[PDB]
Design a protein around this nucleic acid. Sequence first.
DNA 1: TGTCTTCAACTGCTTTCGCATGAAGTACCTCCCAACTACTTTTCCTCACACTTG
Length: 54
Amino acid sequence: FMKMSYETTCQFLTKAVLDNEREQLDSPSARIVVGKLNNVGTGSFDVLAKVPNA
DNA sequence: TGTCTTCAACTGCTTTCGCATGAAGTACCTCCCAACTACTTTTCCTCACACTTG
């Protein structure tokens, strides 16, 4: 997706499809394309909660 | 038989963000339309000739 979103979009698309490529959705641009929390900065980690069991 | 070299044709881009305010193509064709004039249209009106008379 980072290739697609710079230049020769269709050329990078063609080389991607011909590869049967899978996007691991790491590129910040690519991640934006899919509406995903950006992996940089505050999205570099996850937050969980400690909850009482009793 | 096998590998190598230059040139020219082809690909893709080369500031960002907004106002304005959108308009305008047009050949080939025309049927519709507006026109001037004349012609035509529907109801109505009023008189008239012949045979016969005496």
